[PDB]
Amino acid sequence: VCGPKKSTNLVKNKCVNFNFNGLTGTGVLTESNKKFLPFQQFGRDIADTT
Amino acid sequence: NQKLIANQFNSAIGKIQDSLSSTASALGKLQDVVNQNAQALNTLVKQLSSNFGAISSVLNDILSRLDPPEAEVQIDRLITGRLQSLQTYVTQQLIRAA
Amino acid sequence: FKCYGVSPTKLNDLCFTNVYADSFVIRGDEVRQIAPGQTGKIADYNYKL
Numbered sequence: 001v002c003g004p005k006k007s008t009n010l011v012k013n014k015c016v017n018f019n020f021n022g023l024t025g026t027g028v029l030t031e032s033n034k035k036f037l038p039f040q041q042f043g044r045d046i047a048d049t050t
Numbered sequence: 051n052q053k054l055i056a057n058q059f060n061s062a063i064g065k066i067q068d069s070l071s072s073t074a075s076a077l078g079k080l081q082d083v084v085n086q087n088a089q090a091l092n093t094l095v096k097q098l099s100s101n102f103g104a105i106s107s108v109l110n111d112i113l114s115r116l117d118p119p120e121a122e123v124q125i126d127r128l129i130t131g132r133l134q135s136l137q138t139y140v141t142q143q144l145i146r147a148a
Numbered sequence: 149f150k151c152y153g154v155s156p157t158k159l160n161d162l163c164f165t166n167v168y169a170d171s172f173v174i175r176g177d178e179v180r181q182i183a184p185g186q187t188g189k190i191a192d193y194n195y196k197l
Contacts, residue, residue, distance in 0.1 A: 005160065022114060023111075024113075114161060120155065
């Protein structure tokens with residue numbers, strides 16, 4: 001259940017300000033080689049950060 | 051006894067190599083320093099996940115949810131906890147450094 | 149229109165996994181009991197947040 005916001009295109013391999021389903025932060029978005037399972041939405045670090 | 055002495059010396063060095071090669075417990079004094087420093091930082095990082103009374107441990111989740119008049123309260127709770135965490139860390143490093 | 153865990157103007161930026169709309173009729177004087185941290189005839193025995 002998301003608000004009335006317009007989505008945009010994703011820019012890879014650059015420093016960006018992102019918002020994924022209300023989850024915000026700053027970082028570089030790159031293709032992963034992480035073996036996500038079909039039910040997993042995101043992963044976390046030891047610091048409990050995305 | 052020069053030949054005897056030189057031979058005993060040479061043998062003793064060979065024994066040192068075998069002792070050090072066989073067991074790493076021999077250098078526990080240096081490994082202990084590494085382990086304590088690693089623990090001090092692992093603890094410091096893990097503290098970031100604590101709420102300390104805040105609604106969320108994640109600063110960005112507070113800011114994306116609350117307006118400043120309320121967000122600041124939740125943030126102050128995290129700052130106090132995280133600032134206190136660093137003070138604990140630094141004090142421990144200073145004592146360990148001594 | 150009072151929000152507790154969120155601000156009312158941030159609602160359009162956030163996205164949830166579930167929204168539940170709990171719907172009922174009470175008398176005006178007891179509307180103040182529909183909140184977290186409350187006590188009273190409604191808050192304790194009838195409808196609690």
